[PDB]
Amino acid sequence: QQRFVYDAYQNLVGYYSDDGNYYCLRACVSVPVSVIYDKETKTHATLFGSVACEHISSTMSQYSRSTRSMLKRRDSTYGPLQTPVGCVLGLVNSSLFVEDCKLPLGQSLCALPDTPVPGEMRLASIAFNHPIQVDQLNSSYFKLSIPTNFSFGVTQEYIQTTIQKVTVDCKQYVCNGFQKCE
């Protein structure tokens, strides 16, 4: 009899229609957007939040936003790439591995710019650097891994001990000399 079904925080979540049906009511949902930018080559790709590339198009004409146009996305213009972090536009599946990247996409993923017209960015993954593997013996001996060469190395470290000491002249800051303000 009270057709409108609300939730704890005064949001309509249900409706009893005249047709004799109960309808769940949702809110229209936004598609999150982020830009992967490499500066020293002026290259860019687009990452679409956590969407599955079926809801996105090369024009996104079914959605609307204040930004007037999408990124250029030149002649390559292949289909959207599906990644563990979401749908990406302007990336080429590379199946490479890196030790580190300057722009990590998430969970293991990096955008590798086509550094030496620069090409499209590649979708690489971070690889785990396996330590030296030493196996256990089944005897009264044991295997020992020992260096035969060495080097010295300097680790630099800064430890702050102070901040700049500053006093302000409150009366002058607020009124700057004017007798009326005083």
Partner: peptide, 16 residues
Amino acid sequence: NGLYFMHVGYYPSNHI
């Protein structure tokens, strides 16, 4: 605004 430490360490290589 503080101190700058330079730690010299011994780094091994060429393990057998």
